[PDB]
Design a protein around this ligand. Structure first.
Ligand code: MG
Ligand code: ZN
Ligand code: ZN
Ligand code: ZN
Lengths: 65, 76, 48, 570, 49, 55, 48, 390, 600, 72
DNA sequence: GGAAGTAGTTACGCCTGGTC
DNA sequence: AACTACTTCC
RNA sequence: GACCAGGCG
């Protein structure tokens, strides 16, 4: 849905890094280099950013009022 | 020449006398109707002189007890 | 009625379709005879 | 036949036409019917497939469509009859002059849930079947429309994730836009015997951070039914003077209109739509709608609307937060089902020399008997994908080979076998063996233990047999069948059989006339017991028997059979 | 509505009903087989109209 | 005289049922003991008033 | 895809995978129990 | 300690023991006395331990043996997943094995789906394959169609033409003239002319074509040699002994042909065993066949359960099924029979004859809600009233 | 008529089997830390289901406390019944008065508490061990808990399994359950007279890791494992070795011997016997005097020969032969010579000990567990190549008429049988090569040779060729005419074209081999349901035929009308549950035991 | 209190059915418009009552307590 | 003896929903 | 449907 | 209440 605030495994905060990672990867930079620059060294943290889906945009359209 | 009693499957049969039949019936407190029955047309019965109403003692040759006696009444 | 409707309805229900029913039945009989002679294998029912 | 297929490829004949011949019996079959399952193939002529590189480039650039390729005679549709005449190759380098067709994609022979499985050819067929069947029971954002949809039951995983090792077919279909599951860090070791026998050990800290979290939706419906004669029911908070009135506490959240306010916490047996119906007892009866006795939650949405006939209709949706607990069923795409056998704190979990803590632990004893090498390859691929920052292709037959994954894992700075040096959390010393650890895509199934637990001390009974009702939804009792009766008999338990089958289901007392054997009659008005069949008053005694046996006596006394009963003194 | 929804189903009295295809035998095609009981060769056809 | 499993079960059940209806315990038992446990303690000690009859 | 045969009977020939299912019916996706082999799902390349 | 004193003590203190237990104890004590010097005290202590362990292992009265036997046979059948099995070798015979075999035996089939007999041989024909193949030929029933290489019919001349393979005739012992001699007397008014290895039949009484076809069917189906109902026969070796396995079933005829050992010949058909050898032999065959079938699948079930089932199956003097037409159908209780399978038929017929249900069984007492007479349901209790707490 | 007959009719649906009160059902989860005769009950179920306890002299205080607690607090009660039979639900403004008016002779339906007896049942109910009586142990979460050793009787495997819990309500029923149906009993199966309640996978593998050759443990590990197992001990035995740093080390055999009876003595060969010469040497040493010098045995100690002497393990490794679903030598001897409480104590202690060993020592399975060197791969490749060439030669001979039929079958069946024999032999040889090359230090091999989980066939299919697939005992033939798939030439009878999969699971299957394996798996999955239905019907028939047969007080077996079925049960009078693997008495075991007892 | 010693099965005689019955049924109806059972119908209160609030004419017991009675 | 007919069965629970 | 077993016409 | 469908072990 929306990017998790913390890594499920070790609790490192990765909420802010997702949008930077997405824009840098779309810019054409190497994903490994981007993830290293962001500070995610453990592959548990890299799993959180690499496998996340922004589903909030696709469901914001329907309101419950 | 060949009797069915020489077969390995067939255990040895024998007809009990009246005294032995009475002792058997008293031992288990049973009537002849409470015993297992063997048909009078059975080959083992015919190989003997057994007639309906008679008790046959069978030496079963058990695998667990070695020998084991089983009793059957003759019916028509 | 059972000839025109209940036997080979796909051929037709009019008396004009009776003859084509005869040809189809003859073809089916020829197939069963060929199976009797062993010239053809059994038809698989699970074959798609 | 050659003319037919040449005409079809030339385009003058429709796609639906298929033709085959049989040299054995000299028969040519032409099919143009409906309902034939077909598959596409690339036409190969004289050892050269019709499809070329420029066709592929045109398709990639959007200049050419699939229907175009079918119309030009490049790709052909064959059913079983025409395929009988074919000699299909499976790979482009396998094509010879004797081949008639080439396989477009051998990985497309699988179904969609079966295509969800990565590396399916490294698994045993039963486990592939289990994984394909369990892929349809996972929790995730199935549809973005769920919020305003009215459905009897639904689930919503709070943080769905893309499988790190995934087939390209899953992206082409659209499964990536609606993922169902998460990537776990899985260590394959035996831990305190709580993952024994296909059980699963999970991390408490991971759960508390959102792993496998979900919400359960239930939509209750209440209609203002219009009976004959203008006798309608009313949406209202009923006064205690109405018949069948529940406790005044159960109407705590109701509004004067008769409907429960949204976002109000509702627990079991609390009403949502206060409703009263016209009296039919022999004051207005109550027919209000309350939540199911074992279900709680928060009222997410209350809508009001009008039926087809014109009566008012209200739908109330209750959402219950389901944090994983012991007993909840988890599965992987490779058919490894299991329930949470233990929830372990993070400080008790083992950790790796690289600082990696498992989110889940699986016993190694479930690996060899099941022969799921695909799960190990998927763990290796998931670790490699996480380390690289690029997802690993796990397609059925053209995916990344295991050797390439092992070499890449070696070059990334980790052991090529996937084993890592791990430390015991409890004692602090490293384990003697190197532990296999990786990333496996686990999915939470909807078989939650909260939706299955049931207990019935005593409750409603069926009118016909006086035995307990059936079902978790209606305080049912568990069926102690005849197989369990034989089990009890084989133990020699005679009084326990009496207690389980007579006292606790339908024990009753009947009056039997000793003279006739029929069932005597007791006149509660005249305070007398007698047998109408014979008029006896002194030879009457009670007997104790199950109500089902009295009913059986009734059905035997019907169809004209006399079950005379003889009594004994005990 | 979800744009990902593919349709192909009906809504009957508010409930979504999907019609599952049925794997019937090919109509109007005769199949030959052996009874193996009376040594009788049997050839049957399912004619549809 | 050696009791069978079924004779032992019947004796213990009858003794527990009697105890549950006010029959005094023939030994000393810890407080909070359930009547079945009291009957089992009685049997284990050996003070068994109930006698089984055989054909 | 479903078959009209009764699920109770042991349709050994009808519950097994056929060589003609290649590319038409999924070889692995089928329910466990009585419906095994009698309930089938289409392959991704299948066209009807 | 002398060797005869061992047997004397066994007979003295171990009189309350089965005969096989005494024999085994005697042999084992002999061996251990040969190895180690066993004193009198050790021997007496061993005897006492043996008798105590035997007394501790005796079955407890009131035990529900029948339902335990039923459970211990039915439960392994869920893991009888081997079912059909095929073996590759020179000489093997097809035979139903596994769960269908157990169902066949317990249901007491009139004739199994794959009848098959094990034929032993006497000392005169049990040590050479050449001397056994002749008696196997004497057993196998072979007809003209089996011996024929091909068939041919000429209806215009009322001619039936039979091509015959010389090789299988060499392997069947029958010569062409030997084939035709008995066929001549089997059906009269036929030429029965043999042309080398291609016999030709021209019946003169076949006025119609269908008459010639019926004559051809009769001639093909007529058995030239062997015993009726017997098909393919194979030869196998074990323990330096050659035995025969047949695809047919005919017990008495096989026991009467020369060369067979009449003391060991067997049959898969239990009913035929009973009719030829007696009810006790049928019970023994049932027991050992079920034991062998369980052993082929690696499942271990105690022999005693098999004995109980077989003895209950052969309690009426005949082998009868276990289902509604057998042991269950012979139950005296009306409600017990009506609970199993056919219910309205049993109740209506019981009402017709006015049968009484004495409620002496387990099922009916469960139906009514009264104690069953098994386990704790057989224990009668008595009590002296005056109780004095200590 | 429809009301009466049928599975849903009156007789089967409401008389033989019927729904009952005071029952519960939920998912089961493992719990190695409860005894074998205990069950973990959720607090919700304990508060819901009640046990009617008539208040007496001794339980007046406890029932007063639980009436005071009421239906809300777990150690409470729901209803109070006066001697007159009038029942009152406990609620607010009632708890104090009802507690005051408890008196004596009243009935109080109290909550389940620790020690209560219940019936636990996973109900495909085939044998009498499908229902056993367990002691209640109340647990926080909402799932049933079950000890791992009690799984084999229930056939439960914690993959979503649910089991029913029935609470007996009368004191007679409670006594019947606690005396006849408790899980301490029924350790020995009535089916085969062998242990059915034993270690399954982790207990066996941890026992092997404990008792194997060269397995040593530090002082802290030894103390921790002994405390975890529940073994009572105040002093460690003398250490066996000393580390390079001087640290004392204990052998696994000593730790295992710490929980054996001090009189037990037995020897046997387990599944880990690969060199029979060493076992023969050990047996020759033992047979000379029956009390060999312990150091002499330690000189010739072998992992494939278990030899316990006076409760000390002197040789051998713990295997499935020590304790298991079948053929548990040590467990059988402990349950037959020392009682049934000693067997339960030993089972609990050994399960906890082995679990600790396997947990803190590390047991894993990875990709490397299926790896083979280049030489083994080449040998397997040559095996398949020779098998394919042999099949080609057979096909060519059959095409030229050169082959002649085997007796009992036609030419086609002869060729088929020969081809299947060749393929099976090739699979066996490749599996032999894999077995030779993989070794005993591989964890996948360890759990297969010790019987913990998996057979040699699984390792062969995972590290070497999959072998020939088959349906109903025949080669794969269902498909197109003259072939299986349209990727093979019609009329082909070769190995690959008919289902012979030449790839391992590790090497990955080709699409043709994948379809062939799918066919094999489908035939197995189809077989399962048909087999279970047929077996269920046959079991029902057998039970309905043999229900009432019982042993009378004179030792005979009689029909309800009095007909004698057997004059002595089993023809010798020994119950199969109490027998020694079907034997009346183990004569040699008794002789050796007595001779060691006296001469020792 | 007694226990059932045996059950004898027979065929009911017409006089047995007439005497055992509590009502002779003539009207082929179940309930009236208001919701009460029709006298002479299949649901006559002389055969027992199942609807709460009704009373049996043969026993006087309420629904769930009246065992039920036969008609002919 | 056929040669058809006829009848009788075909595991045990459990859960969900939907329509009468 | 697919098995058995009777029954029952032949 | 019984019918259908889908699952679970
Ligand atoms: Mg399970
Ligand atoms: Zn992290
Ligand atoms: Zn009367
Ligand atoms: Zn009444």
């Amino acid at each position: 849905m929306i990017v998790p605030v913390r890594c499920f495994t070790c609790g490192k905060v990765i909420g802010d890094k997702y949008y930077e990672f997405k824009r840098r990867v779309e810019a054409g930079e190497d994903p490994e280099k981007v993830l290293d620059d962001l500070g995610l060294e453990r592959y548990c943290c890299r799993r959180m950013l690499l496998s996340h889906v922004e589903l909030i945009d696709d469901i914001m359209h329907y309101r419950v009022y | 020449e060949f009797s069915i009693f020489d077969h390995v499957l067939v255990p040895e049969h024998r007809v009990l006398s009246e005294e032995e039949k009475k002792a058997l019936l008293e031992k288990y407190k049973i009537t002849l109707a409470q015993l297992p029955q063997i048909k009078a047309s059975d080959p083992a019965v015919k190989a003997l002189g057994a007639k309906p109403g008679d008790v046959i003692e069978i030496k079963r040759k058990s695998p667990t007890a070695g020998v084991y006696y089983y009793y059957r009444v003759v019916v028509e | 009625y059972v000839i025109d409707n209940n036997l080979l309805p796909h051929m037709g229900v009019s008396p004009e379709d009776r003859i084509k029913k005869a040809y189809y039945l003859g073809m089916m009989a020829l197939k069963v005879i060929e199976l009797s002679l062993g010239r053809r294998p059994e038809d698989d029912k699970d074959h798609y | 036949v050659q003319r037919i297929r040449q005409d079809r490829r030339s385009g003058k004949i429709s796609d639906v036409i298929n033709v085959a011949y049989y040299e054995d019996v000299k028969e040519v079959y032409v099919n143009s019917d409906d309902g034939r399952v077909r598959r596409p193939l690339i036409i190969v002529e004289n050892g050269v497939p019709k499809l070329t590189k420029e066709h592929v480039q045109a398709v990639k650039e959007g200049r050419l469509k699939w229907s175009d390729l079918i119309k030009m005679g490049i790709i052909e549709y064959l059913d079983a009859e025409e395929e009988e005449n074919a000699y299909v190759a499976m790979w482009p380098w396998e094509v010879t002059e004797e081949h008639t067709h080439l396989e477009l994609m051998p990985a497309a022979i699988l179904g969609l849930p079966a295509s969800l499985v990565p590396y399916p050819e490294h698994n045993a067929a039963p486990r592939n079947t289990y994984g394909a069947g369990m892929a349809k029971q996972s929790l995730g954002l199935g549809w973005a429309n769920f919020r305003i949809r009215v459905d009897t039951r639904g689930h919503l995983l709070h943080y769905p994730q893309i499988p790190l090792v995934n087939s390209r077919i899953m992206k082409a279909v659209g499964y990536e836009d609606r993922p169902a599951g998460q990537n776990f860090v899985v260590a394959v070791l035996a831990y305190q015997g709580y993952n024994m026998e296909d059980a699963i050990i999970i991390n408490k800290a991971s759960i508390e951070r959102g792993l496998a979290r979900s919400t359960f939706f239930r939509t209750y419906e209440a209609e203002e039914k219009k009976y004959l004669g203008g006798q309608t029911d009313k949406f209202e908070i009923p006064d205690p003077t109405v018949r069948g009135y529940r406790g005044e506490k159960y109407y705590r959240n109701l509004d004067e209109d008769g409907l429960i306010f949204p976002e109000s916490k509702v627990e079991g047996k609390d009403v949502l739509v206060g409703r009263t119906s016209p009296p039919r007892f022999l004051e207005r009866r109550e027919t209000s709608v309350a939540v199911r006795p074992s279900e709680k939650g928060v009222v997410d949405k209350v809508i009001i609307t009008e039926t087809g006939d014109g009566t008012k209709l209200v739908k109330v949706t209750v959402r219950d937060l389901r944090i994983p607990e012991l007993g909840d069923k988890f599965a992987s795409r490779h058919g490894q089902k299991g329930v949470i056998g233990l929830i372990v704190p993070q400080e008790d979990m083992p950790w790796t020399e690289s600082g990696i803590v498992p989110d889940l632990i699986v016993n190694p004893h479930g690996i060899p008997s099941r022969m799921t090498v695909g799960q190990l390859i998927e763990a290796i691929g998931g670790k490699v994908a996480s380390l690289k920052g690029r997802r690993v292709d796990g397609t059925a037959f053209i995916g990344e080979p295991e050797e390439k994954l092992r070499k890449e894992l070696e070059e990334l700075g980790f052991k090529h076998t996937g084993r890592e040096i791990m430390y015991d959390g409890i004692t602090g010393k490293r384990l003697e063996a190197d532990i296999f650890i990786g990333v496996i895509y686990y999915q939470r199934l909807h078989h939650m233990v909260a939706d299955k637990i049931h207990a019935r001390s005593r409750g409603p009974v069926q009118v016909l047999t006086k035995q307990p009702t059936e079902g978790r939804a209606r305080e049912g009792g568990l069926r102690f069948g005849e197989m369990e009766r034989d089990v009890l008999v084989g133990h020699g338990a005679a009084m326990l059989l009496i207690e389980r089958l007579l006292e606790e289901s339908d024990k009753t007392e009947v009056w039997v006339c000793e003279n006739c054997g029929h069932i005597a009659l007791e006149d509660k008005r005249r305070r007398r017991v007698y047998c109408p069949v014979c008029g006896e008053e002194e030879r009457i005694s009670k007997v104790e028997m199950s109500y089902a046996f009295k009913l059986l006596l009734d059905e035997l006394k019907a169809m004209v059979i006399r079950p005379k009963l003889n009594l004994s003194e005990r | 509505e979800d744009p990902k929804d593919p349709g192909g189903y009906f809504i009957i009295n508010g409930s979504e009903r999907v019609i599952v295809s049925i794997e019937d035998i090919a109509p109007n095609r005769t199949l030959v087989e052996k009874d193996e009981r009376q040594e009788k060769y049997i050839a049957k056809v399912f004619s549809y109209r | 005289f050696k009791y069978t499993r079924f004779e032992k079960a019947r004796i213990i059940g009858a003794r527990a049922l009697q105890i549950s209806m006010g029959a005094p315990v023939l030994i000393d038992v810890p407080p909070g003991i359930t009547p079945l446990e009291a009957a089992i303690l009685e049997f284990e000690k050996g003070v068994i008033p109930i006698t089984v009859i055989r054909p | 895809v479903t078959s009209p045969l009764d699920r109770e009977q042991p349709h050994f020939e009808a519950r097994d995978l056929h060589g003609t299912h290649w590319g038409r019916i999924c070889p692995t996706e089928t329910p466990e129990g009585p419906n095994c082999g009698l309930v089938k799902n289409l392959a991704l390349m299948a066209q009807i | 300690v002398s060797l005869s004193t061992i047997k004397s003590l066994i007979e003295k203190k171990g009189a309350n023991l089965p005969e096989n237990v005494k024999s085994e104890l005697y042999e084992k004590l002999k061996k251990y006395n040969e190895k180690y010097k066993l004193t009198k005290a050790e021997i007496e202590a061993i005897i006492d331990d043996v008798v105590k362990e035997y007394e501790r292992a005796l079955v407890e009265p009131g035990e529900p043996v029948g339902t335990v036997a039923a459970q211990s046979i039915g439960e392994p059948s869920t893991q009888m997943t081997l079912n059909t099995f095929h073996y590759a070798g020179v000489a093997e015979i097809n035979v139903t094995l596994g769960l269908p075999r157990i169902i066949e035996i317990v249901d007491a089939r009139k004739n199994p789906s794959t009848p098959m007999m094990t034929v032993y041989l006497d000392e005169e024909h049990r040590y050479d394959r050449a001397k056994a193949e002749e008696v196997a030929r004497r057993i196998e029933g072979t007809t003209l169609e089996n011996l024929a290489r091909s068939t041919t019919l000429d209806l215009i001349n009322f001619e039936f033409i039979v091509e015959i393979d010389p090789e299988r005739l060499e392997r069947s012992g029958l010569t062409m003239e030997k084939v035709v001699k008995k066929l001549e007397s089997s059906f009269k008014s036929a030429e029965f002319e043999v042309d080398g290895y291609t016999l030709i039949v021209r019946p003169k009484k076949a006025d119609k074509i269908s008459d010639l076809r019926r004559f051809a069917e009769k001639i093909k189906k007529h058995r030239l040699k062997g015993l009726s109902g017997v098909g393919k026969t194979i030869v196998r070796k074990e323990g330096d002994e050659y035995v025969i396995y047949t695809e047919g079933s005919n017990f008495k005829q096989v026991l009467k042909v020369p060369g067979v050992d009449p003391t060991r010949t067997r049959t898969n058909n239990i009913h035929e065993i009973a009719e030829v050898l007696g009810i006790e032999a049928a019970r023994n065959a049932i027991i050992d066949e079920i034991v062998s079938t369980m052993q082929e699948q690696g499942l271990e079930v105690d022999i005693r359960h098999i004995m109980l089932v077989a003895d209950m199956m052969t309690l009426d003097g005949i082998v009868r099924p276990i289902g509604r037409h057998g042991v269950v159908g012979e139950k005296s209780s009306v409600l017990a029979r009506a609970a199993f399978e056919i219910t309205v038929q049993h109740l209506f017929e019981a009402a017709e004859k006015g049968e009484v249900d004495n409620l002496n069984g387990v099922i009916e007492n469960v139906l009514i809600g009264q104690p069953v007479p098994v386990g704790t349901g057989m224990v009668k209790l008595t009590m002296k009233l005056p109780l004095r707490p200590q | 008529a429809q009301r009466l007959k049928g599975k849903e009719g009156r007789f089967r649906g409401n008389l033989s089997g019927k729904r009952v009160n005071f029952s519960a059902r939920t998912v089961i989860s493992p719990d190695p830390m409860i005894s074998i005769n205990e069950v973990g009950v959720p607090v919700e179920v304990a508060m819901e289901l009640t046990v009617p306890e008539k208040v007496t002299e001794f339980n007046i205080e406890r029932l007063r406390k639980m009436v005071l607690n009421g239906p809300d607090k777990y150690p409470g009660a729901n209803y109070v019944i006066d001697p007159e039979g009038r029942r009152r639900r406990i609620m607010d403004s009632n708890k104090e008065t009802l507690a005051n008016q408890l008196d004596i002779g009243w009935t109080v339906e109290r909550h389940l508490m620790d020690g209560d007896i219940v019936l636990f049942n996973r109900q495909p109910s085939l044998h009498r061990m499908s229902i056993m009586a367990h002691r209640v142990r109340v647990m926080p979460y909402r799932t049933f808990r079950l000890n791992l050793a009690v799984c084999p009787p229930y056939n439960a495997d914690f993959d979503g399994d649910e089991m029913n819990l029935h609470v007996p309500q009368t004191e007679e029923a409670q006594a019947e359950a606690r005396i006849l149906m408790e899980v301490q009993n029924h350790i020995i199966s009535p089916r085969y007279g062998g242990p059915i309640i034993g270690g399954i996978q982790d207990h066996i593998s941890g026992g092997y890791l404990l008792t194997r050759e060269g397995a040593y443990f530090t002082r802290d590990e030894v103390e921790q494992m002994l405390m975890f197992a529940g073994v009572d001990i105040t002093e460690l035995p003398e250490p066996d070795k000393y580390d390079e740093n001087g640290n004392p080390l204990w052998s696994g055999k000593t730790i295992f011997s710490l929980l054996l009876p001090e009189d037990l003595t037995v020897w046997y060969r387990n599944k880990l016997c690969d060199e029979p010469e060493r076992c023969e040497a050990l047996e020759k040493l033992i047979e000379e005097k029956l009390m060999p010098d312990p150091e002499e045995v330690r000189k010739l100690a072998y992992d494939g020969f278990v030899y316990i002497q006076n409760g000390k393990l002197l040789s051998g490794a713990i295997d499935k032969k020590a304790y298991g679903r079948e053929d548990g030598i040590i467990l059988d001897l402990i349950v037959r010579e020392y009682g049934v409480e000693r067997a339960r104590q030993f089972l609990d202690q050994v399960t906890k000990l082995t679990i600790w060993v396997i947990t803190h020592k590390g047991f894993t399975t990875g990709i490397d567990d299926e790896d083979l060197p280049e030489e083994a791969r080449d040998r397997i490749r040559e095996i398949i190549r020779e098998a394919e060439e042999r099949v080609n030669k057979l096909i060519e001979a059959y095409k030229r008429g050169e082959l002649e039929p085997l007796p009992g079958k036609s030419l086609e069946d002869t060729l088929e049988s020969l081809i299947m024999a060749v393929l099976a032999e090739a699979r066996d040889n490749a599996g032999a090569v894999a077995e030779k090359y993989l070794g005993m230090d591989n964890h996948t091999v360890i759990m297969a040779k010790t019987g913990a989980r998996g057979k040699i066939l699984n390792i062969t299919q995972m590290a070497a060729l999959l072998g020939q697939q088959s349906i109903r005992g025949k080669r794969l033939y269902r498909g197109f005419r003259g072939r299986v798939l349209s990727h093979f030439k019609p009329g082909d009878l070769g190995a690959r074209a008919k289902g012979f999969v030449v790839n391992s699971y590790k090497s990955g299957l080709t699409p043709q081999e994948y379809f062939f394996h799918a066919m094999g798996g489908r035939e197995g999955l189809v077989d399962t349901a048909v087999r279970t239905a047929q077996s269920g019907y046959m079991q029902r028939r057998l039970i309905n035929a043999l229900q009432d047969l019982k042993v009378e007080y004179d030792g005979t077996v009689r029909s309800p009308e009095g007909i004698i079925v057997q004059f002595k049960y089993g023809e010798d009078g020994v119950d199969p549950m109490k027998s020694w693997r079907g034997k009346t008495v183990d004569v040699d075991r008794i002789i050796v035991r007595t001779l060691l007892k006296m001469r020792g | 209190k007694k226990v059932i010693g045996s059950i004898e099965f027979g065929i009911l005689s017409p006089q047995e059915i007439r005497k055992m019955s509590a009502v002779e049924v003539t009207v082929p109806d179940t309930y009236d418009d208001d919701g009460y059972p029709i006298e002479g119908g299949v649901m006559d209160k002389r055969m027992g009552v199942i609807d709460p609030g009704l009373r049996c004419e043969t026993c006087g017991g309420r629904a769930g307590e009246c065992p039920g009675h036969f008609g002919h």
